[PDB]
């Protein structure tokens, strides 16, 4: 029951129209909404909505987020999707297939704590 602002700020039917449009316009990409888990002691990620190549790996996405938020490299970083932590070698396309919500978006939280 993690809140995401894009969900908090728009009704379902608006989101689903928008996810379906973008999936129609970019069939080899997936739309992903990323937010820091609340009260995780890591920097916030300012840009929250991404259109990502389906073949991009979780680990590649980690590396992009780490750079953007200036995470020190001793610090850990984990994705949460529906309370699970995906394998670093999973693709974002597979993560989307397995977890996208009914508005056709994938919602990803992150923290430097896995537990």
């Amino acid at each position: 029951s993690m809140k995401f602002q894009y969900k908090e700020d728009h009704p379902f039917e608006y989101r689903k129209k928008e996810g379906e449009k973008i999936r129609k316009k970019y069939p080899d990409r997936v739309p992903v909404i990323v937010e820091k888990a609340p009260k995780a002691r890591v920097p916030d990620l300012d840009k929250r909505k991404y259109l990502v190549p389906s073949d991009l790996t979780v680990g590649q996405f980690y590396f992009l987020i780490r750079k953007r938020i200036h995470l020190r490299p001793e610090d850990a970083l984990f994705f949460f999707v529906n309370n699970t932590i995906p394998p670093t070698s999973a693709t974002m396309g597979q993560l989307y297939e397995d977890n996208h919500e009914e508005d056709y978006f994938l919602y990803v939280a992150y923290s430097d704590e896995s537990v």
Binding site: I22, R29, P31, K47, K49, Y50, L51, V52, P53, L64
Partner: peptide, 10 residues
């Protein structure tokens, strides 16, 4: 950045 979604590559 199409429709406020940041387009990533790779």
């Amino acid at each position: 950045e199409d429709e406020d979604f940041e387009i990533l590559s790779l």
